Amino acid sequence: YGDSYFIDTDLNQLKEVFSGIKNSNEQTPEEMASLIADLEYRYSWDCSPLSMFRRHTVYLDSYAVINDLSTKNEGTRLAIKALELRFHGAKVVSCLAEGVSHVIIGEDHSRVADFKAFRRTFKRKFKILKESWVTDSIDKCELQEENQYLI
């Protein structure tokens, strides 16, 4: 490509080099995201303050029932939650598979009974934080340091 060992490419030259390289779709989104995460972790690029939810595929249980198309939650804030999740790179999923490692319910947290029942059943001990943490991305708009995770 246009990159040279004697003449370095500045912002504009690198932009032109990238544009000259044709852009298409040849890699699956899952594989491309996985390689992005691996490269970012290999040289500490995932620490960007705007994109940290690439690995954390948070499942939002916006559906009370399963496989029912006769209802539509109009005027609800679930779209706001989806936008907040996709701002940092997290993509929500509506179909359950084996790749989902987190289950998050909406403001209806009075369902602690099923969480208690599933703690004894599931060996995958889930982690549920307070709803203030997600609002901290708007109010504080700052990441949470690792010093909070202590004894």
């Binding site: 370095d8 490419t9 960007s48 705007l50 804030r77 706001i80 708007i138």
Partner: protein
């Protein structure tokens, strides 16, 4: 089943107030009952086969323009610019819905009225339906005010999110390009160093 409260005031006797309450029932094709009240006496309406037949065969309306006239004359649908002399003869107990259209009095409105079967069934219904209508008005007012507050707060939140995402994109393009330049320059330096070593290997 419903009472239509329409603002109306008599002209002949301003002290005595009567309501031109055309409380049409559901399935108006089946029929309707007129409701005129004064405080102590009421009146209703009946529908008969002969009455339906004469209504169909006398006025002779097939794809006409009487719906608007019904809405304006009976429900006072006209704007508060033209006064309608819908005076109910209290002394005669005769309601003639004559049309004072530019001071021309044809023989238009003259139909019989039926004796009320029970004034209670209309008086109680009116005094309960007015309260029910006020209560539901207050309820929908409160609910829509709450919805207005929710809309305002979510609009402000998503405007803030729009500003934040614009800033994030503007910083992301620049810092991504800078990181790419740094990585590629480091890789080029690695290539140059390895080539220099191989040149005198």
């Amino acid at each position: 089943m419903e009472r239509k409260i329409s603002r109306i005031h008599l002209v002949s006797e301003p002290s005595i107030t009567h309501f031109l309450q055309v409380s049409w029932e559901k399935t108006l094709e089946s029929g309707f009952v007129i409701t005129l009240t004064d405080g102590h006496s009421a009146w209703t309406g009946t529908v008969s086969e002969s009455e339906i037949s004469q209504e169909a065969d006398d006025m002779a309306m097939e794809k006409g323009k009487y719906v608007g006239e019904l809405r304006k004359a009976l429900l006072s649908g006209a704007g508060p610019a033209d006064v309608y002399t819908f005076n109910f003869s209290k002394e005669s107990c005769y309601f003639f819905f004559e049309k004072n259209l530019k001071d021309v009095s044809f023989r238009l409105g003259s139909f019989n009225l039926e004796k009320v079967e029970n004034p209670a069934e209309v008086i109680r219904e009116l005094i309960c339906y007015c309260l029910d209508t006020i209560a539901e008005n207050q309820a929908k007012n409160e609910h829509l005010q709450k919805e207005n507050e929710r809309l305002l707060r979510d609009w402000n939140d998503v405007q803030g999110r729009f500003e934040k995402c614009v800033s994030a994109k503007e910083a992301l393009e620049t810092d991504l390009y800078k990181r790419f330049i740094l990585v590629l320059n480091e890789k080029k330096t690695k290539i140059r160093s390895l080539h220099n070593k191989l040149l005198n290997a």
